[PDB]
């Protein structure tokens, strides 16, 4: 019943190709909605929305930016130097999310790290926990973070103090946009013929906001058990697109309808008849 | 671990011949992140814009590629994806239907 996003995350993608070539890509997100970009060369933030700074002062935003810029430079150097120690082999990808999340009531925070596309570590409550699969390399990394107490303290501050404050400020700042209701456009088509005498009936639903939606093939009142729920896919304008498909006999397609439920529609679902 | 890209192609609005619209190509579930995504008009490249790189809860990457197009009964549109896990560039055609 709470509308729009409930979490903020910094996101890091770091590619290590060889001893002399490494790339960082950074960004900031409210659930799956990008509100910050990051220019890697200069270490410059990009404020994608009028309310991207939430309730933070310019000086506080600038300090945080300076901090992230230094982090990328240091992170890169440290990994490069410890390639042998951690027996990493080129090419390799490190991924990191860090941020916090509302839970109906105390805000939860953590940093999660991945290596080779797999859970590597998570850092919470001034504690490093290596992922169960991470091995000695994981335990070694956590041991290492305790040699880096300054960096560890900065991160814990960011997680426990700064982030909860930022998340609450930014949900309020972007409230109008984050809780707007946008009605879906819906349409039906028939997809590639799947076999003799059968139709692929496709219900397309696009342009709705927020994300939760329920789309279902019906015959009168009975939900059709063959209904295939496609994955939510993004559009470029903070709405989503969904395909819901039904593989049905040709002489049975008559009387079917697609029922679209969405918060923007109140109790009145959109209905689309096949003929 | 290496994972092949999944590709879906779709229009922003209900397609209607001769009516300006947007074509979306969503490429996801892949690893590593290096990738080449091009939308195509009759097998040729049109100008598109590409979202910043991101990833899902399971660490797999995704990108949204999108461009202005005007559909009509004559022209074919597709999305072409180059990735280390693909022997040859994979083409997924816009199936309006
Ligand atoms: C950005 O917003 C943050 C989130 O605030 C909430 O959401 C915003 C949108 C707005 O609705 C606020 O009213 C909400 O609180 C701010 O952080 C919160 O600040 C408030 C203070 O305003 C904190 O609260 C206090 O908690 C104290 C801890 O014990 C209490 O002593 C205190 O209670 C007293 O005051 C209230 C009156 O408000 C009385 O009812 C009580 O009787 C009692 O006298 C407050 O309840 C809250 O903890 C903060 N929330 C979080 C998650 O950190 C933030 O404000 C800044 O940061 C905080 C930590 C303080 O240093 C503030 O002075 C400071 O301005 C904003 N951040 C920025 C940069 O502006
Ligand atoms: C608002 C815009 C959004 C931008 C997007 C940002 C994206 C960032 C994303 C995530 C990062 C979240 C935390 C950032 C906190 C800042 C850190 C900091 O304190 O910042 C530190 C970082 O240095 C480091 O040494 C980085 C530590 C990384 C250690 C990694 C080594 C491990 C190697 C082994 C590899 C194994 C696999 C690894 C798994 C991955 C696990 C991570 C330095 O400072 P500072 O005081 O000089 O400062 C002063 C400011 N100026 C200098 C600019 C003036
Ligand atoms: C590293 O990668 C770059 C291209 O990304 C290449 O030019 C260079 O020769 C490579 N090798 C070394 C040893 O730096």
From TrEMBL, chain A:
One of its GO terms (cellular component) is endosome membrane. Glycans are attached at residues 18, 125. It comes from the Eukaryota. GO terms for biological process: adaptive immune response; antigen processing and presentation, endogenous lipid antigen via MHC class Ib; antigen processing and presentation, exogenous lipid antigen via MHC class Ib; immune response; positive regulation of T cell mediated cytotoxicity. It is found in: Cell membrane; Endosome membrane; Lysosome membrane. It is a single-pass type I membrane protein. Keywords: Adaptive immunity, Cell membrane, Disulfide bond, Endosome, Glycoprotein, Immunity, Immunoglobulin domain, Lysosome, Membrane, Transmembrane, Transmembrane helix. GO terms for molecular function: endogenous lipid antigen binding; exogenous lipid antigen binding; lipopeptide binding. The keyword Transmembrane helix applies. Disulfide bonds join 100-163, 128-142, 203-258. Heterodimer with B2M (beta-2-microglobulin). Interacts with saposin C. Antigen-presenting protein that binds self and non-self lipid and glycolipid antigens and presents them to T-cell receptors on natural killer T-cells. This is CD1b3. It comes from Bos taurus (Bovine). The gene is CD1B3. The chain holds residues 21 to 295 of 333 of the full protein.
């Amino acid at each position: 019943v709470f509308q729009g996003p409930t979490s903020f995350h910094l996101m890091q993608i770091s590619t290590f190709v060889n001893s002399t070539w490494a790339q960082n890509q950074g960004s900031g997100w409210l659930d799956d909605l990008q509100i910050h970009g990051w220019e890697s060369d200069s270490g410059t933030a990009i404020f994608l929305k009028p309310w991207s700074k939430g309730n933070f002062s310019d000086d506080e935003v600038t300090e945080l930016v300076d901090l992230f810029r230094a982090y990328f430079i240091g992170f890169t150097r440290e990994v490069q130097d410890r390639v042998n120690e951690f027996q990493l082999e080129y090419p390799f990808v490190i991924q990191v999310t860090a941020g916090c999340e509302l839970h109906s009531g105390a805000i939860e925070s953590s940093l999660r790290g991945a290596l080779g596309g797999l859970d590597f570590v998570s850092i919470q409550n001034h504690s490093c926990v290596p992922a169960p699969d991470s091995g000695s390399r994981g335990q070694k990394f956590c041991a290492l973070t305790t040699q880096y107490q300054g960096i560890s303290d900065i991160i814990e501050r960011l997680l426990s103090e700064t982030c909860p404050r930022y998340l609450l400020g930014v949900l309020d700042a972007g409230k109008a946009e984050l809780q707007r209701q946008v009605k879906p456009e819906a349409w039906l088509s028939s997809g590639p013929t799947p076999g003799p005498g059968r139709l692929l009936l496709v219900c397309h639903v696009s342009g709705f906001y927020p994300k939760p939606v329920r789309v279902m093939w019906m015959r009168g009142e009975q939900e059709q058990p063959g209904t295939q729920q496609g994955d939510l896919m993004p559009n470029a304008d903070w709405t989503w697109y969904l395909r819901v498909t039904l593989n049905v006999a040709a002489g049975e397609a008559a009387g079917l309808n697609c029922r679209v439920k969405h918060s923007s529609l109140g109790d009145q679902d959109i209905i689309l008849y096949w003929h | 671990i290496q994972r092949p890209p999944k590709i879906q192609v779709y229009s922003r609005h209900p397609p209607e011949d001769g009516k300006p619209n947007y074509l979306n190509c969503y490429v996801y579930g892949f690893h590593p992140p290096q990738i080449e995504i091009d939308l195509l008009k009759n097998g040729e490249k049109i100008k598109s814009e590409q979202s910043d790189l991101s990833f899902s809860k399971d660490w797999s990457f995704y990108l949204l590629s999108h461009a202005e197009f005007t559909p009509n009964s004559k022209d074919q549109y597709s999305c072409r994806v180059k990735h280390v896990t693909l022997e040859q560039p994979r083409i997924v055609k816009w199936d309006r239907d």
